[PDB]
Amino acid sequence: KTFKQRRTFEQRVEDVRLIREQHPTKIPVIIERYKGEKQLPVLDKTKFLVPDHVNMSELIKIIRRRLQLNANQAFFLLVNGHSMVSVSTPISEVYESEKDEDGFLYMVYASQETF
Ligand SMILES: Oc1cc(O)n2ccnc2n1
Ligand SMILES: [Cl-]
């Protein structure tokens, strides 16, 4: 079901290495629905190439547009398990500190802060 489950550490590492070669200015982001989630829909896809100049606040807006949410639906975006200290951080900076050893940046979303 989950991304890490579907691909070998070997395969995830090699995909990231190719995204580096073919999409050198993009951050490779896995975005997954919380296994508990009941309200929000599932994304059309799992793997995202996010432009490296956008801050986390702009990535939250991109995904809420991808989910086609309305303004009073709730949406939380956990990076690397935990809450973000700050949505003003550039995703280039968040990548360099929160990236997995496979080189993806993992995120989960829910309607509740209590995931
Ligand atoms: O939409 C939001 C708002 C937040 O404060 N966070 C913190 C981590 N992920 C978030 N997503
Ligand atoms: Cl590029």
Curated annotation (Swiss-Prot):
It comes from the Eukaryota. Changing Q112P: Abolished delipidation by ATG4 family proteins. InterPro entries: Atg8-like, Ubiquitin-like_domsf. It is a lipid-anchor. Transmembrane segments: none annotated. Gene3D superfamilies: Phosphatidylinositol 3-kinase Catalytic Subunit, Chain A, domain 1 (3.10.20.90). Changing I31A: Decreases C18 ceramide binding. Keywords: Autophagy, Cytoplasm, Cytoplasmic vesicle, Cytoskeleton, Lipoprotein, Membrane, Microtubule, Mitochondrion, Phosphoprotein, Ubl conjugation, Ubl conjugation pathway. Changing R64A: Impairs cleavage by ATG4B. Most abundant in heart, brain, skeletal muscle and testis. Little expression observed in liver. GO terms for cellular component: autophagosome; autophagosome membrane; axoneme; cytoplasmic vesicle; cytosol; endomembrane system; microtubule; mitochondrial membrane. It is found in: Cytoplasmic vesicle, Autophagosome membrane; Endomembrane system; Mitochondrion membrane; Cytoplasm, Cytoskeleton. Ubiquitin-like modifier involved in formation of autophagosomal vacuoles (autophagosomes). Plays a role in mitophagy which contributes to regulate mitochondrial quantity and quality by eliminating the mitochondria to a basal level to fulfill cellular energy requirements and preventing excess ROS production. 3 different light chains, LC1 (a cleavage product of MAP1B), LC2 (a cleavage product of MAP1A) and LC3 (produced by one of the MAP1LC3 genes), can associate with the MAP1A or MAP1B heavy chains. Interacts at microtubules with CABP1 (via EF-hands 1 and 2) but not with calmodulin. Interacts with FYCO1 (via C-terminus). Interacts with TP53INP1 and TP53INP2. Interacts with TBC1D25. Directly interacts with SQSTM1; this interaction leads to MAP1LC3B recruitment to inclusion bodies containing polyubiquitinated protein aggregates and to inclusion body degradation by autophagy. (Microbial infection) Interacts with Hantaan hantavirus glycoprotein N; this interaction contributes to the virus-induced degradation of mitochondria by autophagy, which leads to degradation of host MAVS and inhibition of type I interferon (IFN) responses. Belongs to the ATG8 family. This is Microtubule-associated protein 1 light chain 3 beta. The lineage of its organism: Eukaryota, Metazoa, Chordata, Craniata, Vertebrata.
